[PDB]
Write a protein that binds this ligand. Sequence first.
Ligand SMILES: [Mg+2]
Ligand SMILES: [Mg+2]
Ligand SMILES: [Mg+2]
Ligand SMILES: [Mg+2]
Ligand SMILES: [Mg+2]
Ligand SMILES: [Mg+2]
Lengths: 90, 189, 180, 256, 89, 226, 59, 213, 251
Amino acid sequence: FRDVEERRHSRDVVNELPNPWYDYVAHALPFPDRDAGYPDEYGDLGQWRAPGGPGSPVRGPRGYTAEWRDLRNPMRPPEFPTPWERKYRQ
Amino acid sequence: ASLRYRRPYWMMFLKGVDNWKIYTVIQQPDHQRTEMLYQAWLGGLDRPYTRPKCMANQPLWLSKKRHMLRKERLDGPETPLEKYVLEWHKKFHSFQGTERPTPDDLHTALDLVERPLDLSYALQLLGQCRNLNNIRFAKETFLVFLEACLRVGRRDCAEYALEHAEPLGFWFIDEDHRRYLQGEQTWYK
Amino acid sequence: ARAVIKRRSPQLWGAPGAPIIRMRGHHVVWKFQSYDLVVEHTHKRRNSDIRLLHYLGKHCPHPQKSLWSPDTPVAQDRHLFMLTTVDIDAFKYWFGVKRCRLSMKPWALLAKAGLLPPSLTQNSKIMPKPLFDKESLMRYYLANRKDEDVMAREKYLNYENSMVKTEEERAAERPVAPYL
Amino acid sequence: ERGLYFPINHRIVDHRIAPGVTVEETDVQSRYRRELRTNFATGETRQTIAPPWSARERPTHFFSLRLPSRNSVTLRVKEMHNHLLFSHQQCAPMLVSPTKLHITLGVMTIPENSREELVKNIQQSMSETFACVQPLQLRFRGLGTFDFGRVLFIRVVPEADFGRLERAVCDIRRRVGGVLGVDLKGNPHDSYVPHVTVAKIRPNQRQQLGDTIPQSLWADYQHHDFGDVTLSTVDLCRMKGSPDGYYHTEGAVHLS
Amino acid sequence: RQIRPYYNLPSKSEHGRKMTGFLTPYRHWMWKQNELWRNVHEAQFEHLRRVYKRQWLESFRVNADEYIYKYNITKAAQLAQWECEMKEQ
Amino acid sequence: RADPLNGGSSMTLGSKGSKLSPEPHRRRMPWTAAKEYVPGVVLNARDKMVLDGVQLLDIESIDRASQLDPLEVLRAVVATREYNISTGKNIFQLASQATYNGRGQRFYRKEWQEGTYDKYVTLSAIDFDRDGNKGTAYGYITFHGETTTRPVQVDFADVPGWYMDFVEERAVPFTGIVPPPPSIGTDVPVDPHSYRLKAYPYYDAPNPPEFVERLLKDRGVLPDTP
Amino acid sequence: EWLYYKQFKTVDYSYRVIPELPEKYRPHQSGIDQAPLPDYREINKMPQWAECEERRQSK
Amino acid sequence: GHYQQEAFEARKRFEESTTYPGPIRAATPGDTRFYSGSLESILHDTDRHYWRAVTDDPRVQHLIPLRIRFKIFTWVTSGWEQRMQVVQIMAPKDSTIAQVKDLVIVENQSPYLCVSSFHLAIDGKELDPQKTLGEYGITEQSQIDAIEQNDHLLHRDDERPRDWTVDEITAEDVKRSPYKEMEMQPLQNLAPRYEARPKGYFGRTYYSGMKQS
Amino acid sequence: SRRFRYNTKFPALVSYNKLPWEVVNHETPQFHMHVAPHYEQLLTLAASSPVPHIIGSKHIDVPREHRLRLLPGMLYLLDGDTLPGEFTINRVLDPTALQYYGRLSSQIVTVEAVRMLVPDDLRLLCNCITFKGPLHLPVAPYASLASLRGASSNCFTLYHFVRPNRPPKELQLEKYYIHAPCVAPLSEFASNSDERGNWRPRLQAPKRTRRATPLPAYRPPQSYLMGLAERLAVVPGGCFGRRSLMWGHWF
RNA sequence: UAAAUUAUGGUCAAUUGUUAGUAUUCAUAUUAAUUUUUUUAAAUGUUUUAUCAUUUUAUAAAGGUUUAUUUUUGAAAGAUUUUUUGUAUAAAAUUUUAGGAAUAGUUAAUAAUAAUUUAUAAUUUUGAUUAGAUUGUUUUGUUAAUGCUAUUAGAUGGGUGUGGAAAAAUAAAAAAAA
Ligand SMILES: [Mg+2]
Ligand SMILES: [Mg+2]
Ligand SMILES: [Mg+2]
Ligand SMILES: [Mg+2]
Ligand SMILES: [Mg+2]
Ligand SMILES: [Mg+2]
């Protein structure tokens, strides 16, 4: 039965098409990948707050550095003269 | 459907014992004096008595002493045969016996027949040596049985033994002994 | 192992037994009736929640008209709809890793979804059950049997590890000059 | 009926037996609370333990705090002796003579060839260590055992000038054994347990006396208080019982 | 249940059940046939069992690892921030 | 646990089997081990309609008024022997009749010799208890030309399903020692003409045609008219 | 089957055999006294066939 | 096995070390009596109730936990059983087998064990009461049995106790021995209340190492 | 089922559910049941390679004192028939007990006699098994049994000392299961044999004009059967094999 | 101790009684409920097996508990053979009564001890123990709202101690080895 089926299975062309349900497990983990709308440390609802704020986990931190070089005085003409509209650069 | 969870553990694989729930409640005082009276009713003892703690059966020793205090029947033995029959029942029917009869003791027992009563006895013992105890006979067995059929002058039983010798299990019958009950002479001497 | 068996709701093998995937709902007037795919133990208590491993989904056994989609002249799509929410990761976990059991009606659902081949209990009573004999089967098998290693490699990729390392990613991951 | 159904003190699993055994095969009984009985109860003490090679050789010289005349210690130990001998006179060979009482600050093995260089050097470094330390008033109460109940001694309680002692000791320890390689029976980075040895069982004795001092003798004195004593004098000594009625002394330092 | 037909070996007893399961060689053969069929089913079935097991294990490998990536970066960030606050302290 | 049916495959409860393993499933109940059993009810069940029109006496009824004609006693005995073989023959009923209590003879139960099943017992020794028809029976199992290394108590010796055949060749006196018969693969060089293997580990029998008829005439493939 | 088992007080209809416990479960409390001691000479009187066969044995 | 000789070898080669400072007891902790869980678990002396990832210096064991096995007759309510009961002492390393017997005699709490004189034996061979554990190579892994006076008489029906199932217990012996303490005549709370195993537990043949059918 | 971790349930002193300790009784047949299949293995070993304490001469002699710290466990083979000093002699004529020596007697040396010996104090034992004739096994020259006259005066004996009523462990037979080859079938091709030139190889399989004679047609059994042996977990014969392969049971 | 913008962002808090000098949450209001109405339940025979037995089938009877209720895999899941592992029974917090007094097989150390081991013991006014009432720590109603006001039910000692676990004596609506 197995072999017959493999045969007529591989014979049809509408197989060889990935089936999202059959092929994998999207997310194995018990906890969600990103924050969805659950109440905050103040007890306020998901709709009442946006993630990425002051409650979010902290991001943390002689001569000259490599950040000194790239920088340039606006008095001197820059690298390739991209035609900025004057109004925008104002 | 096992009684595992209905009765005490020790009652597992309990078969053939009458109304086993009895032996569950025997500890309670009333059931217990009921048992005292029961044992006394069974007799064989000097004292008030009760079967031990979790035991459903009676003890081996007690039923043995019941069996050996129980008076045998036949209190009048006359022929040597009846003596030997009572001895036969003493040895080989003794409670929980290991030992088993030998064809030679059946010879010895079949040689004492006189009256037809005794023939009935020895034939019942023979019935016991075939059916009950499963013992193979010898050649001379049917010789002995034949001459003992002849002593009391009943030859019906001989030919009845001949027409079917397989159920009684005589595996060898000398053909001349067949002739004797089948219509031909020259048997003895 | 109960002295007096609870007679009406028997089960195999004591409590709580295997994890099993059941379909269940409180009983009501047929018009509103819904079911729940639930992973739970074999022996339930008064309330189904005491032993509940996971909640696999709602299933509504009322063919529905699709008013969500714009009314479509395609023939097929205007058949009525049957709506079911499967949680497929807890399914593949419980069934795959934890080795679940299955009642039959959930099986039929999960078959319509392409998670499982159709059940044992779905019978077109048109065909009979097949016959069998060892030497005809044997002739067919001698005719077609694949090579040993091809098959071993199949069993490898299906059961054991799938994602493997082709030459290029090895060559891409091995350390360069200052530590090479 | 007079207490808990299963007394909590009786609940014991032995994991040094085996996974399947005690369920099925056999049951193992023991009196398990002799083994559990702790370091406070037995009177044991964990002394700096020697490395094997050092464990082989006898000690020769030791550091000692010398006890002055008119101690509280010597007096009360004498009373203790009297009481002990009246109870059991089998102690008589165990007991140390009240004349030989001293505090042991550390023990050491000196080879006999380099002997003079080492006593000179030691004495010098020792004098340098204790130059700044003024006299020490220490407290003695409680008893304890070394060497599996063979050595019975009086503890030095860390309630007093003891703190200074520990620094002081830990200095000579890092000089004597650290600087000029000398065999201190332990590691020079570890501190010795200071003690007053009261009763003792030597290797020769062990046949007539027994393998351990029976705890029935010193049980009642186990926590007894021997009092405070101030000590100005440090010695480095070679072990001889004969010469002065006291240990033969190869060096001294005065704390003042 | 286990089906006990009428042509199974009847037991004559008043002390117990009326019919013992014991089989006419026919019934036995029949049973073997039906069983074979069902075997054909469970083959695919538990095959799919171990397929989903590896699926889930693999997806766990990938996602859990990504989680360790992100999480460790977080944890390092916090630790940096803390020891900074202690320099400031 | 140890040895499942079709590996673990759980798709049904019956999919496992009627037992999960040969071994006892609870360690506290040993006798639950998988044996080969025999229908004790039917195969004891001795016929009391052979005992009709008989007048059996009893063991402890010895009385003079009690017992009966020697002819009566004889036909009674015959009806009792007829009572005991009324289903089949117990081993101790076969062995008491053979010379030397049938030591060395090959005792096969009926079903062991039919179908692809081939098995018997080479009897090592026997104990008769005071009662015959009961007892203990030791021996060597031989299964498809393969033989046991040491003797074993022969199981279900007391159930009357047993046949054997007396050969003088195999008989051993009580003096000597019953040898275990040769396992045909090892001690005797295998030969096709003397012994051919009925069935081997991967083999099974072809379909008998009338079973097939019955099953199709059942499932309704081949029609059947009243 | 079921009708046979029904006569038992089994609470769950379990195909187990469970007896009762009557008030008098044993002979002595049901009034019955022992068993009558058999007269031995009475049952040692030879039977009819035996005497008749003495009659054809002496002829 | 592997572990035994691996560790023995390690000890032996650690003692032959010329240069070692010795351990620092500040870095070598003892064990705790304080840990989660209700039960008090006794472990090996090289093991601890916390997680210690570093392997400690091999030490010689100065108290060896010997096990000594006895035969006992348990009342199982269908009759007597013969099963095994261990006593476990802590015997000082250099101790004499005489002294080991003495330890054993002091450490058993069962009234049914030490009644008469007994000899310690390994694999059937008796040991000298005179000599040390050192000579007989007794490692705590060793199997040590204990043989009583009457133990070779047990194959009879005399020395082996008589169960009220098959034997008379008389007014003679109701006032003596395990028979007395047992209270054969059933009480309301049912007496000492021993363990029971039924007759058909092992089948018709009793428990064996060899499969008898 | 697996054995559980520890017993916290019942008091230890009372010990509760315990598999009975198996003891070997020398009065009964069961004794031999244990000891016999060992002996055969032992003798087999002796037929191939040397083992030190197996062959010895002139019995053994020890004091009354050291009797039990030396003897128990001892197993050795002597040439003649002489029964040990100070042992009451018991003949084993009971058939059941004898029965277990069947394999050893047919496929190794034939057993002439078995003897159970008990001493004056009754606390020792000796199992004494006298074989008649040469082995039905081949014996190698460098083997232990090659030092004996009774093999290769045709009677010789095996002596086994033991304590009574002990578990079937401390009779020491399991140290003997070392397996050495019988070199008899290859002795033919050694440089030593002169029949090595009468040997001829089959390198190629011979050309086959036939097929195997088809087995007798299958008769389906007529009686009542206990059901699938698969589903009942019965090994194929109730004898040996895996429960997954149902070969040779009724079908 | 300075303002702020690259401009409405991060998603709705919103209160409705016709009274009677004045002081004080108090009759008649709405919402929620009981008064209030047969459209969601249901009937008995659990079941195999090797036969007088043995395998499978573990939390709805009542009693009134406020410092109170806590636990394993040895069963099944479960995959190949045999050994094979360790993890558990313990705690912390929340605890009612208008007018308030002592409680008790009793604490801690010893230990597989002690119906008479040792001790200056334990619980209580920071509210105990008895006694009353009462089914404990995601469930309701009212409300703009810190509140007020509900929440069922379910673990009731031991006495041959079976069983992995006592949850084991009608009262299912859990397919229980084809
Ligand atoms: Mg309730
Ligand atoms: Mg109250
Ligand atoms: Mg609390
Ligand atoms: Mg608590
Ligand atoms: Mg399992
Ligand atoms: Mg009760």
